Amino acid sequence: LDDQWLVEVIDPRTLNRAERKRLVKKNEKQQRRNMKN
């Protein structure tokens, strides 16, 4: 979806990267949670 030219309905790929990094950081946060407990 980065290079895919037209998207068929905010720029819609930036939201996609935003959610990507959202889940990535949730994972990397829960990593610390498990390390501490």
Binding site: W5, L6, V7, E8, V9, D11, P12
Partner: protein, 119 residues
């Protein structure tokens, strides 16, 4: 190269993920990397409204009324050049009439026969 709200633009892909591929729309939005287009699509018998997001190299400008403006200019020109005289202007476009009678001459041209020999 400044696409704004209201402009009218074509689509061109310099794989086949979506095929609008040369349907002309109107811009409603612009960003540093993408553009927004609207499209009228026939769903049954009516033109319903679709929205689209396209990159910059995958778009261009249109040349639709390019002849319209030149022709209304020249219409205005000959209109006054007609008022400035006595005239039968007739400033409308007509379709291709049927061609009229002529005579062809056979002096360097004696008709060179051929048959389906084939050759």
């Amino acid at each position: 190269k400044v696409y704004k709200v209201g402009d009218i633009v074509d689509i061109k892909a310099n794989m086949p993920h979506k095929f609008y591929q040369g349907k002309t729309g109107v811009v409603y939005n612009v960003t540093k990397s993408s553009v927004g287009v609207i499209i009228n699509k026939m769903v049954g018998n009516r033109y319903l409204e679709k929205r689209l997001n396209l990159r910059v190299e995958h778009i261009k400008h249109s040349k639709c009324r390019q002849e319209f403006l030149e022709r209304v200019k020249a219409n205005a020109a000959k209109r006054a050049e007609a008022k400035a005289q006595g005239v039968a202007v007739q400033l409308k476009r007509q379709p291709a009439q049927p061609r009229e009678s002529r005579i062809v001459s056979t002096e360097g041209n004696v008709p060179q026969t051929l048959a389906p020999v084939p050759y």
